[PDB]
Amino acid sequence: SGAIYVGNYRVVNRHLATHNDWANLVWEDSSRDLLVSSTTAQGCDTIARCDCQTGVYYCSSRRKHYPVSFSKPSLIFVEASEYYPARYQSHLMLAVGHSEPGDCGGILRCQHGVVGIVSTGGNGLVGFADVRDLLWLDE
Ligand SMILES: Cn1cc2c(CC(=O)N3CCC[C@H](C(N)=O)C3)cccc2n1
Numbered sequence: 001s002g003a004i005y006v007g008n009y010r011v012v013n014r015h016l017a018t019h020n021d022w023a024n025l026v027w028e029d030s031s032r033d034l035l036v037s038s039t040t041a042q043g044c045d046t047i048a049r050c051d052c053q054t055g056v057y058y059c060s061s062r063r064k065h066y067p068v069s070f071s072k073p074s075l076i077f078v079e080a081s082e083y084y085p086a087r088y089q090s091h092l093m094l095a096v097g098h099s100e101p102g103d104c105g106g107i108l109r110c111q112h113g114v115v116g117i118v119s120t121g122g123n124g125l126v127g128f129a130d131v132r133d134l135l136w137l138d139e
C-alpha cells in the first residue's frame, strides 16, 4: 500500500484505488496504473522535477529503504494479472531490487523529492510509475 499527498490531491496505484478515490476522481490512467483523487486536507509532499536516475525506495515487505539506479520512464511489457490483461504500461522505470505485490504504493525519492511509486515487480526487477511529468500536481 501507499500514496503521495500533494496540495489537494492524493496519488495512488489505479489497481488499489478505493471507492472514495473514484467518488472524488480528478484523473486516472490505466496504461500508467495511476489515479488521482481530491482531498479536504492540504498535503505537503514535494514532487521532483528532474531527470535523476538514482534514488531510494521504501520496501514494506522488508521494512527497509533501498538505493537503486533506475531507467528513464518508458513503455514496458507487464504480464497479465487480476487487474489488467497483458499490456505495455507507459511511464515505467525499472531497478534491480526486491519487491512483492504488497510493496505497490511505496515511494521512490531522489535528492529533489518524490519521483514516483512502486507499481510492478518480478524476476528481481522493481517497476516504478513516474510522476515528475505531472506538473499540474503543484499548480
Ligand atoms: C511491486 N510488485 C508487484 C509484483 C508482482 C505483481 C505485479 O507486478 N503486478 C500485479 C498488480 C498490477 C501491476 C501493474 N502495474 O500492472 C503488475 C509480482 C511479483 C512481485 C511484485 N512486486
Ligand SMILES: [Zn+2]
Pocket: 048, 049, 050, 051, 052, 110, 111, 112, 113
Ligand atoms: Zn531528482
